[PDB]
Amino acid sequence: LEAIIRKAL
Amino acid sequence: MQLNPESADLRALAKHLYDSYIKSFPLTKAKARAILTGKTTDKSPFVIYDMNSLMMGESVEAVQEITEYAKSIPGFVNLDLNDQVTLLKYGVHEIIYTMLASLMNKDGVLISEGQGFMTREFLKSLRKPFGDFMEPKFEFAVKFNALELDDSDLAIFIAVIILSGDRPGLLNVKPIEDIQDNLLQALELQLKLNHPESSQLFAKLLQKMTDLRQIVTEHVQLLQV
């Protein structure tokens, strides 16, 4: 989703 | 080859990636194969093989686990934050289908963290085009599991896929490839020490990455429906 990835980082 | 400081650092890199492989993912292959084979652990999974068994049993989670494992790869957190998202954007689907082969045998796939087991033929009996959703993944898994990798092999193999310097939209490609070159060295040594019987298993694993991108390409085409 790219939004899920741009969060755990 | 010889046991020298460069070799020991590659093994220490393999051990570090393996420990993060265990911390990040709950259901590993070693526990998956134990459930699928005889040496099963706790409660036996509920097998779903037809419509009646589906009734009496009535991806987003994996994306978060893979990102946690990528943060443990040495040098991944030091890259540009935009490239970190780009690597995980085009690689998470290649990882998920690699992890999926660990939960698969020739009969079906392990689901619900090992609580269920849906057969391959029941998935293919579903209505079109849902009957073609999991079939490409099973054909890949039969060929992939024929390599007989364990969690120590997959931990480094998963790391090499993440550090792919050919992803579209990478701002800094050189530092990404320097990490993959270090990961490829550790993966080559890991396969030579762990597989004395497979000739050129390192070359065969790299060719499986081309097969993974064909699955993701075929999967996206199936998702436009």
Numbering used by the authors:
A (entry chain B): 141 to 149
B (entry chain A): 202 to 259, 289 to 455
Relevant lines from the article:
PPAR forms a multiprotein complex with a retinoid X receptor and corepressor complex in an unliganded/inactive state, and ligand binding induces the replacement of the corepressor complex with the coactivator complex to initiate the transcription of various genes, including the metabolic and antioxidant ones.
We also revealed the structures of the unliganded PPARα/γ-LBD–NCoR2 corepressor and PPARα-LBD–CBP/TRAP220/PGC1α (/SRC1;) coactivator cocrystals utilizing X-ray diffraction. In PPARα-LBD, the α-helical LXXLL motifs in the four coactivators were located near the AF-2 helix 12 that was formed upon ligand binding, whereas the IXXXL portion of the consensus LXXXIXXXL motif in the NCoR2 coactivator was located in a position that interfered with helix 12 if present. The enhanced degree of structural flexibility of the amino-terminus of helix 3 and the carboxy-terminus of helix 11 to helix 12 of both unliganded PPARα/γ-LBDs was supported by two independent solution-phase amide hydrogen/deuterium exchange (HDX) analyses that revealed stabilization of the PPARγ-LBD AAs 279–287 (helix 3) and AAs 470–477 (helix 12) by rosiglitazone.
